[PDB]
Amino acid sequence: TLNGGITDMLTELANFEKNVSQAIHKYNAYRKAASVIAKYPHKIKSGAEAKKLPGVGTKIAEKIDEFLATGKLRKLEKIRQDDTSSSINFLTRVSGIGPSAARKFVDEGIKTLEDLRKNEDKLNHHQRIGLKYFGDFEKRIPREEMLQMQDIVLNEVKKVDSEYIATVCGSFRRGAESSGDMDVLLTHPSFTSESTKQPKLLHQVVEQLQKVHFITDTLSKGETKFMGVCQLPSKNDEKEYPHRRIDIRLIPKDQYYCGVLYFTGSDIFNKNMRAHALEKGFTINEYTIRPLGVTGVAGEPLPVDSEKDIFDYIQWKYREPKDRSE
DNA sequence: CCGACAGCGCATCAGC
DNA sequence: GCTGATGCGG
DNA sequence: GTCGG
Ligand SMILES: O=c1ccn([C@H]2C[C@H](O)[C@@H](COP(=O)(O)NP(=O)(O)OP(=O)(O)O)O2)c(=O)[nH]1
Ligand SMILES: [Cl-]
Ligand SMILES: [Cl-]
Ligand SMILES: [Cl-]
Ligand SMILES: [Cl-]
Ligand SMILES: [Cl-]
Ligand SMILES: [Mg+2]
Ligand SMILES: [Mg+2]
Ligand code: NA
Ligand code: NA
């Protein structure tokens, strides 16, 4: 974190374009610049120095010079003062409320935590739970708690069927000392790219986890993806653990590597890798890596038997999960 | 300049 | 009821 | 907002 001041600035600028301006490309431009600068092993001394890095252009370089000289950015100082922008940025922090709903509520005058609570009636199910656990979802999860959660998930899944294989991905698999949430990749021999010999595969698991009171709420749920809430059990007289966000993805067993690659992230890593893939003439999703014909249309899935095989197709040396945190 | 910028599952809605 | 588009995950 | 062709 040699350039934390600069990266935080780029991140605030990113959120602004995302939440207020609804300009996703500017959002990603800022995030890319922040990321590349985050792994830069030197304390940046000038906008020009930073401009040498890919993803950092003239505009961002000018802002870096402003930030390095004054220790702040006028554009942000003004944005921070703007009531609408402020309110819109804040509301988007509730899970379920994005830029559109945020601006929408702000129009109606609903712009504070208090306002949301006195208007639950104006929230869909997901946004309702997000408000309920607003404080909790703001908290980080120490890796030690992730370990306890991992144990519960793997053992409970094993109890449903010994053939299930639950792998904890996301930032956890990347070695992080704390996570924003828990992401679980699920596989079972009965569900392959070729067939679904068994129904309720994901349901059974969700059900069992709810049975033992690990999963407390549901944000969204389908046959292959579950997005909800969970909580570690506390001992007698012991304060309860904060509620945690949990995501579970059931992927075809034979497409495991593409699935684990995707779910391990990071999101920026995935976007960079998938983009590189396109330039190399391939397309990558959580199921497969396919070549791109002359027309540009995806071809048939190429054989994959490891994460490395995917890296090899696009001519990228293998990168351990811990080195994919972009 | 100008087009590209990753990919997709679930919830919700408009139009039929 | 469906399909298609959009918001959200994030 | 940044980049490549
Ligand atoms: O936009 C996205 C979001 C997530 N993902 C993938 C990569 C990411 O590592 C994984 C889990 O998503 P999270 O939003 O949970 N992110 P991550 O676990 O990396 O970080 P955090 O610690 O915040 O949960 O899903 C994408 O491909 N694109
Ligand atoms: Cl944009
Ligand atoms: Cl994105
Ligand atoms: Cl600032
Ligand atoms: Cl695979
Ligand atoms: Cl596919
Ligand atoms: Mg995560
Ligand atoms: Mg997640
Ligand atoms: Na640059
Ligand atoms: Na939100």
- Domain assignments of chain A as residue spans, ordered by start: 3-82, 83-139, 140-262, 263-325
The residue type at A18: K
Q: Could you give phi then psi for residue A247, rounded to 5 degrees?
A: -125, 135
Handedness of CA A61, A62, A66, A69 (dihedral sign): positive
Query: CA A316, CA A289: separation in Å to the nearest integer?
Result: 14
Q: Which residues, 6 or more positions from A148, have their beta carbon under 8 angstroms from its beta carbon?
A: A232
**Residue A61 CB partners (closer than 8 Å, separation 6+):** A47, A48, A50, A51
Helices (H), chain A: 4-15, 24-38, 47-51, 58-70, 74-81, 83-91, 99-107, 113-117, 125-132, 134-138, 143-160, 170-173, 201-211, 256-264, 267-279, 307-313
> Which tokens sit at A239?
């304060």
CB-ligand 1 contact for A263 (6 Å cutoff): yes
- As assigned by CATH, the class of the A3-82 domain is mainly alpha
Pocket test for ligand 1, best of A31, A171, A268 (most atoms within 8 A of CB): A171
**What are residue A191's phi and psi, to 5 degrees?**
-120, 105
- By annotation, the residues of A acting in catalysis are 63
Q: For A225 and B13, how far is CA from C1' in angstroms?
A: 21
Q: Which CATH class is domain A140-262?
A: alpha beta
Q: How was this structure determined?
A: X-ray
- The CATH superfamily holding the domain A263-325 is DNA polymerase, thumb domain (3.30.210.10)
Q: CB pairs under 8 A, 24+ apart, for A201-206?
A: A201/A250, A202/A226, A202/A248, A202/A250, A204/A160, A204/A161, A205/A156, A205/A157, A205/A160, A205/A164, A205/A166, A205/A248, A206/A248
Q: Are strands A191-192 and A195-196 parallel, antiparallel or unpaired?
A: antiparallel
CATH class of A83-139: mainly alpha
Domains A3-82 and A83-139 share a fold: yes
> What residue owns the CA closest to ligand 1's atom 13?
A170
Q: CA-CA distance, A178 to A172, in Å (whole number)? A: 8
